[PDB]
Amino acid sequence: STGSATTTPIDSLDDAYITPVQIGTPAQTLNLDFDTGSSDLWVFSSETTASEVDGQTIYTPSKSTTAKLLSGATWSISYGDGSSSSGDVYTDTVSVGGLTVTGQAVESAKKVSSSFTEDSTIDGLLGLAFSTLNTVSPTQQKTFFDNAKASLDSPVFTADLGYHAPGTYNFGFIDTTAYTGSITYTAVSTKQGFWEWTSTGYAVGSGTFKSTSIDGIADTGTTLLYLPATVVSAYWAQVSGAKSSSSVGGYVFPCSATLPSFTFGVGSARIVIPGDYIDFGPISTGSSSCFGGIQSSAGIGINIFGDVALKAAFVVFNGATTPTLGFASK
């Protein structure tokens, strides 16, 4: 089997991407944030504290003839950005782009933190990291991909995120029309539960390539590109007037700037992030200070190849017995 679904930016900045997901019988379609940096499929629901729901579409398990309470199971997750959610668990039928999993753990939120409530466009998350990170207790549950894997034509999914435009998540096949040139594959460590890999270096603009190992994670659920302070300083030094602002929370730059590109290495291959992808717009409405899309990972504890990086590539998440990651230009 295979599946193919369009993923759409939630706003004009590509702050996140939502993908429609069918849950239950009859189908209840919710727009979920596909997150290769976590491993829980959770939704706003009829159980979510009413004051914490503001415009989201909810899953109502009592209206699904295939929903079953997973007795005794609870979940609770905290994300890198400080947001969180928790609740109980149902199993139900879940379909993405025509690919159906029966008995998928659907984690129903009883509580969500303010950032979730305040984002009316995201009805929940669909985790695509390794199932070892799943938070359900006392019996850990599998991700949608892990459940689907054996049925797939090939044990892979691909992320093809758009810049200020829709893109595609495919399951079970590689669309050879969706990228240019060849796909370069690189080793993955699953030791921390992430799609963790090592970039071979970087360049700023038309500058020379610096060969250096940068360990990080391919994370569709993180907006920005978080890299070591040395790398980030080298980038912003090429933008007149750019500075790190402790009050704003990172590097800002004059909105009048033209940003240089940023290149990262994948083996001997190179992925170029155009400068425009690094612009996250005014820090507040009407400001002439703009927020940068490349920020320091210092104090996160890991480098994160988030959407800024991934949307410059066609990315293969290869879930074979020994997982790997593939990157192609597009």
Side-chain angles (χ1 to χ4, degrees), residues 89-109 112:
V89 187
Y90 293 81
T91 56
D92 209 340
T93 302
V94 173
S95 300
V96 176
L99 169 66
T100 300
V101 168
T102 57
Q104 173 65 45
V106 177
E107 302 173 34
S108 168
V112 303

PDB file of all heavy atoms in Angstrom, residues 89-112, unseen atoms left out:
ATOM      1  N   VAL A  89      -6.462   7.646  26.036  1.00  0.00           N
ATOM      2  CA  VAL A  89      -6.132   7.030  24.756  1.00  0.00           C
ATOM      3  C   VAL A  89      -7.260   6.143  24.255  1.00  0.00           C
ATOM      4  O   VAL A  89      -7.819   5.350  25.014  1.00  0.00           O
ATOM      5  CB  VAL A  89      -4.837   6.185  24.856  1.00  0.00           C
ATOM      6  CG1 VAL A  89      -4.392   5.694  23.488  1.00  0.00           C
ATOM      7  CG2 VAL A  89      -3.716   6.955  25.511  1.00  0.00           C
ATOM      8  N   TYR A  90      -7.546   6.263  22.962  1.00  0.00           N
ATOM      9  CA  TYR A  90      -8.444   5.370  22.252  1.00  0.00           C
ATOM     10  C   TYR A  90      -7.642   4.666  21.173  1.00  0.00           C
ATOM     11  O   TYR A  90      -6.599   5.158  20.756  1.00  0.00           O
ATOM     12  CB  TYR A  90      -9.601   6.171  21.622  1.00  0.00           C
ATOM     13  CG  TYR A  90     -10.491   6.769  22.672  1.00  0.00           C
ATOM     14  CD1 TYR A  90     -10.150   7.954  23.312  1.00  0.00           C
ATOM     15  CD2 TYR A  90     -11.631   6.107  23.081  1.00  0.00           C
ATOM     16  CE1 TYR A  90     -10.944   8.467  24.321  1.00  0.00           C
ATOM     17  CE2 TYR A  90     -12.421   6.604  24.081  1.00  0.00           C
ATOM     18  CZ  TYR A  90     -12.079   7.773  24.702  1.00  0.00           C
ATOM     19  OH  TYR A  90     -12.890   8.251  25.697  1.00  0.00           O
ATOM     20  N   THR A  91      -8.106   3.514  20.718  1.00  0.00           N
ATOM     21  CA  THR A  91      -7.652   3.002  19.433  1.00  0.00           C
ATOM     22  C   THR A  91      -8.760   3.236  18.425  1.00  0.00           C
ATOM     23  O   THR A  91      -9.941   3.175  18.757  1.00  0.00           O
ATOM     24  CB  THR A  91      -7.253   1.516  19.477  1.00  0.00           C
ATOM     25  OG1 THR A  91      -8.346   0.730  19.964  1.00  0.00           O
ATOM     26  CG2 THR A  91      -6.039   1.323  20.365  1.00  0.00           C
ATOM     27  N   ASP A  92      -8.378   3.522  17.188  1.00  0.00           N
ATOM     28  CA  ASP A  92      -9.360   3.758  16.140  1.00  0.00           C
ATOM     29  C   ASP A  92      -8.664   3.606  14.783  1.00  0.00           C
ATOM     30  O   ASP A  92      -7.439   3.482  14.696  1.00  0.00           O
ATOM     31  CB  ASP A  92     -10.009   5.147  16.311  1.00  0.00           C
ATOM     32  CG  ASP A  92     -11.430   5.230  15.770  1.00  0.00           C
ATOM     33  OD1 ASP A  92     -11.821   4.380  14.940  1.00  0.00           O
ATOM     34  OD2 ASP A  92     -12.153   6.170  16.170  1.00  0.00           O
ATOM     35  N   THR A  93      -9.461   3.665  13.729  1.00  0.00           N
ATOM     36  CA  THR A  93      -8.964   3.628  12.361  1.00  0.00           C
ATOM     37  C   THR A  93      -8.502   5.010  11.937  1.00  0.00           C
ATOM     38  O   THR A  93      -9.230   5.994  12.103  1.00  0.00           O
ATOM     39  CB  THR A  93     -10.059   3.123  11.437  1.00  0.00           C
ATOM     40  OG1 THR A  93     -10.452   1.834  11.909  1.00  0.00           O
ATOM     41  CG2 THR A  93      -9.568   3.027  10.003  1.00  0.00           C
ATOM     42  N   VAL A  94      -7.281   5.084  11.418  1.00  0.00           N
ATOM     43  CA  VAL A  94      -6.676   6.343  11.008  1.00  0.00           C
ATOM     44  C   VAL A  94      -6.183   6.198   9.579  1.00  0.00           C
ATOM     45  O   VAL A  94      -5.487   5.235   9.261  1.00  0.00           O
ATOM     46  CB  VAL A  94      -5.514   6.735  11.945  1.00  0.00           C
ATOM     47  CG1 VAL A  94      -4.783   7.953  11.409  1.00  0.00           C
ATOM     48  CG2 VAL A  94      -6.038   7.004  13.350  1.00  0.00           C
ATOM     49  N   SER A  95      -6.550   7.142   8.715  1.00  0.00           N
ATOM     50  CA  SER A  95      -6.106   7.127   7.335  1.00  0.00           C
ATOM     51  C   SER A  95      -5.452   8.444   6.961  1.00  0.00           C
ATOM     52  O   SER A  95      -5.941   9.522   7.323  1.00  0.00           O
ATOM     53  CB  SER A  95      -7.269   6.867   6.390  1.00  0.00           C
ATOM     54  OG  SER A  95      -7.880   5.625   6.648  1.00  0.00           O
ATOM     55  N   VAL A  96      -4.357   8.342   6.223  1.00  0.00           N
ATOM     56  CA  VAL A  96      -3.617   9.487   5.718  1.00  0.00           C
ATOM     57  C   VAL A  96      -3.451   9.302   4.224  1.00  0.00           C
ATOM     58  O   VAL A  96      -2.783   8.368   3.772  1.00  0.00           O
ATOM     59  CB  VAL A  96      -2.231   9.614   6.365  1.00  0.00           C
ATOM     60  CG1 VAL A  96      -1.454  10.770   5.731  1.00  0.00           C
ATOM     61  CG2 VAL A  96      -2.338   9.812   7.866  1.00  0.00           C
ATOM     62  N   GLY A  97      -4.048  10.188   3.440  1.00  0.00           N
ATOM     63  CA  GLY A  97      -3.827  10.169   2.007  1.00  0.00           C
ATOM     64  C   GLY A  97      -4.150   8.832   1.368  1.00  0.00           C
ATOM     65  O   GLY A  97      -3.480   8.434   0.424  1.00  0.00           O
ATOM     66  N   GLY A  98      -5.183   8.152   1.865  1.00  0.00           N
ATOM     67  CA  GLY A  98      -5.563   6.851   1.336  1.00  0.00           C
ATOM     68  C   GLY A  98      -4.920   5.621   1.959  1.00  0.00           C
ATOM     69  O   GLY A  98      -5.297   4.499   1.614  1.00  0.00           O
ATOM     70  N   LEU A  99      -3.967   5.823   2.863  1.00  0.00           N
ATOM     71  CA  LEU A  99      -3.323   4.739   3.605  1.00  0.00           C
ATOM     72  C   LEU A  99      -4.003   4.577   4.959  1.00  0.00           C
ATOM     73  O   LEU A  99      -4.068   5.533   5.728  1.00  0.00           O
ATOM     74  CB  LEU A  99      -1.841   5.070   3.799  1.00  0.00           C
ATOM     75  CG  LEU A  99      -1.060   4.179   4.769  1.00  0.00           C
ATOM     76  CD1 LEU A  99      -0.951   2.751   4.254  1.00  0.00           C
ATOM     77  CD2 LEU A  99       0.319   4.770   5.018  1.00  0.00           C
ATOM     78  N   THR A 100      -4.504   3.376   5.248  1.00  0.00           N
ATOM     79  CA  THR A 100      -5.299   3.131   6.444  1.00  0.00           C
ATOM     80  C   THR A 100      -4.592   2.209   7.426  1.00  0.00           C
ATOM     81  O   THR A 100      -4.091   1.149   7.050  1.00  0.00           O
ATOM     82  CB  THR A 100      -6.651   2.511   6.053  1.00  0.00           C
ATOM     83  OG1 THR A 100      -7.351   3.406   5.189  1.00  0.00           O
ATOM     84  CG2 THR A 100      -7.518   2.216   7.255  1.00  0.00           C
ATOM     85  N   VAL A 101      -4.579   2.620   8.693  1.00  0.00           N
ATOM     86  CA  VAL A 101      -4.129   1.803   9.809  1.00  0.00           C
ATOM     87  C   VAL A 101      -5.312   1.560  10.722  1.00  0.00           C
ATOM     88  O   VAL A 101      -5.950   2.501  11.181  1.00  0.00           O
ATOM     89  CB  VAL A 101      -2.990   2.501  10.581  1.00  0.00           C
ATOM     90  CG1 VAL A 101      -2.703   1.813  11.919  1.00  0.00           C
ATOM     91  CG2 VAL A 101      -1.738   2.558   9.740  1.00  0.00           C
ATOM     92  N   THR A 102      -5.591   0.301  11.014  1.00  0.00           N
ATOM     93  CA  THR A 102      -6.568  -0.023  12.045  1.00  0.00           C
ATOM     94  C   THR A 102      -5.871  -0.198  13.396  1.00  0.00           C
ATOM     95  O   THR A 102      -4.707  -0.579  13.469  1.00  0.00           O
ATOM     96  CB  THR A 102      -7.372  -1.290  11.685  1.00  0.00           C
ATOM     97  OG1 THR A 102      -6.483  -2.388  11.469  1.00  0.00           O
ATOM     98  CG2 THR A 102      -8.198  -1.061  10.432  1.00  0.00           C
ATOM     99  N   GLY A 103      -6.588   0.104  14.468  1.00  0.00           N
ATOM    100  CA  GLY A 103      -6.040  -0.058  15.803  1.00  0.00           C
ATOM    101  C   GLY A 103      -4.950   0.942  16.168  1.00  0.00           C
ATOM    102  O   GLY A 103      -4.135   0.673  17.051  1.00  0.00           O
ATOM    103  N   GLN A 104      -4.914   2.091  15.499  1.00  0.00           N
ATOM    104  CA  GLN A 104      -3.951   3.130  15.831  1.00  0.00           C
ATOM    105  C   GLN A 104      -4.290   3.782  17.167  1.00  0.00           C
ATOM    106  O   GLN A 104      -5.448   4.100  17.419  1.00  0.00           O
ATOM    107  CB  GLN A 104      -3.959   4.197  14.739  1.00  0.00           C
ATOM    108  CG  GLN A 104      -3.109   5.428  15.041  1.00  0.00           C
ATOM    109  CD  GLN A 104      -1.634   5.091  15.116  1.00  0.00           C
ATOM    110  OE1 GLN A 104      -1.112   4.362  14.269  1.00  0.00           O
ATOM    111  NE2 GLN A 104      -0.953   5.600  16.141  1.00  0.00           N
ATOM    112  N   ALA A 105      -3.282   3.987  18.015  1.00  0.00           N
ATOM    113  CA  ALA A 105      -3.488   4.740  19.242  1.00  0.00           C
ATOM    114  C   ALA A 105      -3.702   6.210  18.902  1.00  0.00           C
ATOM    115  O   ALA A 105      -2.824   6.864  18.316  1.00  0.00           O
ATOM    116  CB  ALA A 105      -2.314   4.590  20.178  1.00  0.00           C
ATOM    117  N   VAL A 106      -4.874   6.708  19.275  1.00  0.00           N
ATOM    118  CA  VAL A 106      -5.271   8.097  19.098  1.00  0.00           C
ATOM    119  C   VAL A 106      -5.360   8.677  20.504  1.00  0.00           C
ATOM    120  O   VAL A 106      -6.226   8.295  21.297  1.00  0.00           O
ATOM    121  CB  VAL A 106      -6.607   8.218  18.339  1.00  0.00           C
ATOM    122  CG1 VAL A 106      -7.039   9.684  18.235  1.00  0.00           C
ATOM    123  CG2 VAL A 106      -6.504   7.591  16.941  1.00  0.00           C
ATOM    124  N   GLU A 107      -4.431   9.570  20.818  1.00  0.00           N
ATOM    125  CA  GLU A 107      -4.298  10.114  22.161  1.00  0.00           C
ATOM    126  C   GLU A 107      -5.191  11.345  22.277  1.00  0.00           C
ATOM    127  O   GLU A 107      -5.005  12.329  21.580  1.00  0.00           O
ATOM    128  CB  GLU A 107      -2.824  10.414  22.434  1.00  0.00           C
ATOM    129  CG  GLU A 107      -1.954   9.155  22.275  1.00  0.00           C
ATOM    130  CD  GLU A 107      -0.476   9.420  22.361  1.00  0.00           C
ATOM    131  OE1 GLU A 107      -0.094  10.327  23.131  1.00  0.00           O
ATOM    132  OE2 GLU A 107       0.306   8.723  21.682  1.00  0.00           O
ATOM    133  N   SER A 108      -6.200  11.249  23.125  1.00  0.00           N
ATOM    134  CA  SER A 108      -7.205  12.287  23.267  1.00  0.00           C
ATOM    135  C   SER A 108      -6.785  13.272  24.340  1.00  0.00           C
ATOM    136  O   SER A 108      -6.548  12.871  25.476  1.00  0.00           O
ATOM    137  CB  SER A 108      -8.526  11.619  23.628  1.00  0.00           C
ATOM    138  OG  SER A 108      -9.455  12.575  24.046  1.00  0.00           O
ATOM    139  N   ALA A 109      -6.678  14.547  23.987  1.00  0.00           N
ATOM    140  CA  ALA A 109      -6.233  15.545  24.952  1.00  0.00           C
ATOM    141  C   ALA A 109      -7.336  15.900  25.930  1.00  0.00           C
ATOM    142  O   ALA A 109      -8.459  16.229  25.539  1.00  0.00           O
ATOM    143  CB  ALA A 109      -5.758  16.793  24.240  1.00  0.00           C
ATOM    144  N   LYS A 110      -6.998  15.817  27.208  1.00  0.00           N
ATOM    145  CA  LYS A 110      -7.800  16.426  28.257  1.00  0.00           C
ATOM    146  C   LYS A 110      -7.325  17.847  28.554  1.00  0.00           C
ATOM    147  O   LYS A 110      -8.132  18.711  28.877  1.00  0.00           O
ATOM    148  CB  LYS A 110      -7.755  15.556  29.511  1.00  0.00           C
ATOM    149  CG  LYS A 110      -8.462  14.220  29.296  1.00  0.00           C
ATOM    150  CD  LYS A 110      -8.323  13.303  30.485  1.00  0.00           C
ATOM    151  N   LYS A 111      -6.019  18.081  28.418  1.00  0.00           N
ATOM    152  CA  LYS A 111      -5.413  19.377  28.686  1.00  0.00           C
ATOM    153  C   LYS A 111      -4.418  19.675  27.591  1.00  0.00           C
ATOM    154  O   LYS A 111      -3.726  18.781  27.113  1.00  0.00           O
ATOM    155  CB  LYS A 111      -4.678  19.359  30.025  1.00  0.00           C
ATOM    156  CG  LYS A 111      -5.580  19.097  31.214  1.00  0.00           C
ATOM    157  N   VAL A 112      -4.373  20.939  27.186  1.00  0.00           N
ATOM    158  CA  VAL A 112      -3.353  21.434  26.269  1.00  0.00           C
ATOM    159  C   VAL A 112      -2.850  22.766  26.806  1.00  0.00           C
ATOM    160  O   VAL A 112      -3.587  23.490  27.478  1.00  0.00           O
ATOM    161  CB  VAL A 112      -3.870  21.591  24.805  1.00  0.00           C
ATOM    162  CG1 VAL A 112      -4.421  20.278  24.269  1.00  0.00           C
ATOM    163  CG2 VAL A 112      -4.915  22.705  24.689  1.00  0.00           C
TER     164      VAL A 112
END
